[PDB]
Design an enzyme around this catalytic site. Structure first.
Site, PDB file in Angstrom:
ATOM      1  N   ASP A   1      -0.430   8.621  15.771  1.00 16.07           N
ATOM      2  CA  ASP A   1      -1.305   8.396  14.581  1.00 16.07           C
ATOM      3  C   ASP A   1      -1.834   7.003  14.703  1.00 16.07           C
ATOM      4  O   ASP A   1      -1.948   6.293  13.647  1.00 16.07           O
ATOM      5  CB  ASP A   1      -0.517   8.567  13.370  1.00 16.07           C
ATOM      6  CG  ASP A   1      -1.497   8.900  12.166  1.00 16.07           C
ATOM      7  OD1 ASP A   1      -2.629   8.805  12.495  1.00 16.07           O
ATOM      8  OD2 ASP A   1      -1.169   8.608  10.756  1.00 16.07           O
TER       9      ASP A   1
ATOM     10  N   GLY B   1       0.777  -1.331  -0.199  1.00 12.29           N
ATOM     11  CA  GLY B   1       0.024  -0.048  -0.042  1.00 12.29           C
ATOM     12  C   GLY B   1       0.874   1.242  -0.009  1.00 12.29           C
ATOM     13  O   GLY B   1       2.043   1.286  -0.335  1.00 12.29           O
ATOM     14  N   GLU B   2       0.298   2.386   0.221  1.00 15.76           N
ATOM     15  CA  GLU B   2       0.907   3.608   0.403  1.00 15.76           C
ATOM     16  C   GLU B   2       0.675   4.010   1.846  1.00 15.76           C
ATOM     17  O   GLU B   2      -0.517   4.322   2.250  1.00 15.76           O
ATOM     18  CB  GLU B   2       0.302   4.737  -0.538  1.00 15.76           C
ATOM     19  CG  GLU B   2       0.184   4.391  -2.142  1.00 15.76           C
ATOM     20  CD  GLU B   2       1.700   4.762  -2.911  1.00 15.76           C
ATOM     21  OE1 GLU B   2       2.513   5.275  -2.289  1.00 15.76           O
ATOM     22  OE2 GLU B   2       1.840   4.118  -4.015  1.00 15.76           O
ATOM     23  N   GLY B   3       1.666   4.230   2.628  1.00 18.65           N
ATOM     24  CA  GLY B   3       1.520   4.692   3.930  1.00 18.65           C
ATOM     25  C   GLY B   3       1.548   6.088   3.833  1.00 18.65           C
ATOM     26  O   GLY B   3       1.905   6.839   3.031  1.00 18.65           O
TER      27      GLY B   3
ATOM     28  N   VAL C   1       4.870   1.092   0.864  1.00 17.48           N
ATOM     29  CA  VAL C   1       5.316  -0.148   1.609  1.00 17.48           C
ATOM     30  C   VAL C   1       5.054  -1.466   0.698  1.00 17.48           C
ATOM     31  O   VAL C   1       3.978  -1.815  -0.016  1.00 17.48           O
ATOM     32  CB  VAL C   1       4.078  -0.174   2.883  1.00 17.48           C
ATOM     33  CG1 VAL C   1       4.337  -1.296   3.795  1.00 17.48           C
ATOM     34  CG2 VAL C   1       4.077   1.127   3.519  1.00 17.48           C
TER      35      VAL C   1
ATOM     36  N   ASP D   1       4.385   1.554  12.877  1.00 22.39           N
ATOM     37  CA  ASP D   1       4.847   2.922  12.696  1.00 22.39           C
ATOM     38  C   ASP D   1       5.131   3.715  14.311  1.00 22.39           C
ATOM     39  O   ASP D   1       4.714   5.073  14.084  1.00 22.39           O
ATOM     40  CB  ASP D   1       4.134   3.813  11.606  1.00 22.39           C
ATOM     41  CG  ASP D   1       4.093   3.041  10.389  1.00 22.39           C
ATOM     42  OD1 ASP D   1       5.155   2.048  10.288  1.00 22.39           O
ATOM     43  OD2 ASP D   1       3.560   3.210   9.472  1.00 22.39           O
TER      44      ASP D   1
ATOM     45  N   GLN E   1      -5.375   0.668  10.283  1.00 19.11           N
ATOM     46  CA  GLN E   1      -4.225   0.322   9.292  1.00 19.11           C
ATOM     47  C   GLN E   1      -2.881   0.114   9.906  1.00 19.11           C
ATOM     48  O   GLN E   1      -2.200  -0.537   9.220  1.00 19.11           O
ATOM     49  CB  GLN E   1      -4.147   1.509   8.381  1.00 19.11           C
ATOM     50  CG  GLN E   1      -3.805   1.055   6.826  1.00 19.11           C
ATOM     51  CD  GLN E   1      -3.350   2.268   5.981  1.00 19.11           C
ATOM     52  OE1 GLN E   1      -3.301   3.339   6.435  1.00 19.11           O
ATOM     53  NE2 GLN E   1      -3.297   1.888   4.641  1.00 19.11           N
ATOM     54  N   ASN E   2      -2.769   0.912  10.785  1.00 18.91           N
ATOM     55  CA  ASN E   2      -1.450   0.613  11.771  1.00 18.91           C
ATOM     56  C   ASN E   2      -1.460  -0.467  12.799  1.00 18.91           C
ATOM     57  O   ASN E   2      -0.450  -0.827  13.599  1.00 18.91           O
ATOM     58  CB  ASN E   2      -1.262   2.043  12.492  1.00 18.91           C
ATOM     59  CG  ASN E   2      -0.870   3.034  11.792  1.00 18.91           C
ATOM     60  OD1 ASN E   2      -0.393   2.845  10.796  1.00 18.91           O
ATOM     61  ND2 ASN E   2      -0.914   4.357  12.154  1.00 18.91           N
TER      62      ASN E   2
HETATM   63  N1  LIG Z   1       4.507  -6.100   8.229  1.00 20.69           N
HETATM   64  C1  LIG Z   1       3.962  -4.767   8.118  1.00 20.69           C
HETATM   65  N2  LIG Z   1       2.679  -4.906   7.145  1.00 20.69           N
HETATM   66  C2  LIG Z   1       2.222  -3.731   6.987  1.00 20.69           C
HETATM   67  O1  LIG Z   1       1.306  -3.264   6.402  1.00 20.69           O
HETATM   68  C3  LIG Z   1       2.707  -2.832   8.102  1.00 20.69           C
HETATM   69  C4  LIG Z   1       2.427  -1.457   8.226  1.00 20.69           C
HETATM   70  C5  LIG Z   1       1.647  -0.561   7.360  1.00 20.69           C
HETATM   71  C6  LIG Z   1       1.461  -0.593   6.118  1.00 20.69           C
HETATM   72  C7  LIG Z   1       0.824  -0.052   5.377  1.00 20.69           C
HETATM   73  C8  LIG Z   1       0.315   1.147   5.800  1.00 20.69           C
HETATM   74  C9  LIG Z   1       0.365   1.401   6.966  1.00 20.69           C
HETATM   75  N3  LIG Z   1       0.898   0.538   8.120  1.00 20.69           N
HETATM   76  S1  LIG Z   1       4.042  -3.500   9.044  1.00 20.69           S
END
Ligand SMILES: N=C1NC(=O)/C(=C\c2ccccn2)S1
Ligand SMILES: [Cl-]
Length: 292
Positions: free
Chosen positions: A121, A11-13, A18, A139, A125-126
């Site tokens: 934050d 995705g896009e964090g 990511v 994060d 999603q986190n």
């Molecule tokens: N192992 C991980 N997979 C994730 O998807 C992780 C954190 C994340 C990923 C994308 C958006 C926000 N946080 S850590």
């Protein structure tokens, strides 16, 4: 980076793209994060995160600064709480597993808060789950290191849904209570299968808070009317009964939520005090049904 092979875009964090990636010459599977600007100061703060290790904190394995570019390598988790709550909509997450997830997340907060590190934050999603019944914060510490913007590099609006009222009232020196607030919001959301305050701007967010919990005054929040973005002309809404806010959460649950959602960050319960709360008296660790 040639040490890693991109397996797939996750995705896009907040901070950039990511990737699920694979360590070409140790073979471990990881979350690879490309941080977009690196300032000596962000480097120093991120390197501190590498020692901040706890089972309910997604492990920061490495920080690669090469070129003038910044990569973070995390322990890989295969699912986030947002997906899990979606997949779980027709019936909701069973309450024993909500209790477990809350208790574990408070454990991650208590640890980080003791070393004085905030997330700032927290959001579904986190929060990241495994097949073992674990849940973890991703994060942690990064907001202090890089900022928190309005829009991601891809222009995805950053959500306000879990933002603490002192942040929206322009207080600049917010504390660990910000994380309690967000976790409260997330807790109410797992229970009801609906976001608590789905705001689509700062005022809409603040006004949704106000509508459920009452417009804060000097009685409930000493010093409020003097915060930077407080206006005397805010509408004055009366507080709704919580029994109306989170059915069918039991008395201990509503009691705990209510302490997590205190206006005054000094009155808001700490991570530590919340773990001692009677809500966790019969806590267990069930195994979820994850489809991967
Ligand atoms: N192992 C991980 N997979 C994730 O998807 C992780 C954190 C994340 C990923 C994308 C958006 C926000 N946080 S850590
Ligand atoms: Cl996922």
């Amino acid at each position: 980076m040639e040490n890693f092979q991109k397996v797939e875009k996750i995705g896009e964090g907040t901070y950039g793209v990511v990737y699920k990636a694979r360590n070409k010459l140790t073979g471990e599977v990881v979350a690879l994060k490309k941080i977009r600007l690196v300032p000596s100061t962000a480097i120093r703060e991120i390197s501190l995160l590498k020692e901040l290790n706890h089972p309910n904190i997604v492990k920061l394995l490495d920080v690669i600064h090469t070129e003038n570019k910044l990569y973070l390598v995390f322990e890989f988790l295969h699912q986030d709480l947002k997906k899990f709550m979606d997949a779980s909509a027709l019936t909701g997450i069973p309450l024993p597993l909500i209790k477990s997830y809350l208790f574990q997340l408070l454990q991650g907060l208590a640890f980080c808060h003791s070393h004085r590190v905030l997330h700032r934050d927290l959001k579904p999603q986190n929060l990241l789950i495994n097949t073992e019944g674990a849940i973890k914060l991703a994060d942690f510490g990064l907001a202090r290191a890089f900022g928190v913007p309005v829009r991601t590099y891809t222009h995805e609006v950053v959500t306000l849904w879990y933002r603490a009222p002192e942040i929206l009232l322009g207080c600049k020196y917010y504390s660990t209570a910000v994380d309690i607030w967000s976790l409260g919001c997330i807790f109410a959301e797992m229970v009801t299968r609906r976001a608590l305050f789905p705001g689509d701007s700062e005022i809409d967010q603040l006004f949704r808070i106000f509508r459920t919990l009452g417009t804060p005054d000097e009685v409930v929040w000493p010093g409020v009317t003097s915060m930077p973005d407080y206006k005397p002309s805010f509408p004055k809404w009366a507080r709704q009964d919580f029994s109306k806010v989170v059915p069918p959460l039991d008395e201990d649950g509503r009691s705990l939520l209510s302490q997590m959602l205190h206006y005054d960050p000094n009155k808001r319960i700490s991570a530590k005090a919340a773990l001692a709360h009677p809500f966790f008296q019969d806590v267990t660790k069930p195994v979820p049904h994850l489809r991967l």
